[PDB]
Amino acid sequence: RFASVYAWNRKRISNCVADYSVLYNSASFSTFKCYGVCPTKLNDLCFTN
Amino acid sequence: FNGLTGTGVLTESNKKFLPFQQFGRDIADTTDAVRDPQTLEILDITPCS
Amino acid sequence: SLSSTPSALGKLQDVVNQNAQALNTLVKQLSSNFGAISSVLNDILSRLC
Numbered sequence: 001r002f003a004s005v006y007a008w009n010r011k012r013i014s015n016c017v018a019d020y021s022v023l024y025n026s027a028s029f030s031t032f033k034c035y036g037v038c039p040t041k042l043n044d045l046c047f048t049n
Numbered sequence: 050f051n052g053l054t055g056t057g058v059l060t061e062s063n064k065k066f067l068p069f070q071q072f073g074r075d076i077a078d079t080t081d082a083v084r085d086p087q088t089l090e091i092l093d094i095t096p097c098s
Numbered sequence: 099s100l101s102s103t104p105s106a107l108g109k110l111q112d113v114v115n116q117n118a119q120a121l122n123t124l125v126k127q128l129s130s131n132f133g134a135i136s137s138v139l140n141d142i143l144s145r146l147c
Contacts, residue, residue, distance in 0.1 A: 038147035078129035
């Protein structure tokens with residue numbers, strides 16, 4: 001259930017752990033790019049939102 | 050902890066934090082004290098000698 | 099006269115104040131980014147490769 005881009009949806013992720021374990025390395029994706037944290041370190045961090 | 054990685058000596062703090070603050074900062078912008086994610090004690094971080 | 103007037107020893111107090119200001123300015127430059135993503139080295143290292 002993906003949204004039309006004009007009305008893109010959004011879900012909140014909270015009160016949970018992990019799955020930042022470079023999931024993109026499954027190579028099911030055409031592209032994966034981070035604009036903040038380098039991808040390999042995402043799974044070492046804590047987030048508030 | 051949740052980040053705020055560093056080395057120091059953790060002792061009980063006499064500080065109170067507002068419920069949403071988690072940690073504080075000194076004038077040097079270094080962490081002064083943190084709240085322990087588990088049990089929520091506030092610990093002062095002093096330098097190692 | 100010396101007891102009564104607080105400005106009587108201003109020449110020595112001024113030296114003390116200038117030196118205190120220099121140190122209290124130097125420690126505050128640690129909070130500066132200088133164009134970096136963060137003023138803190140530990141944040142740079144925990145998030146960037």
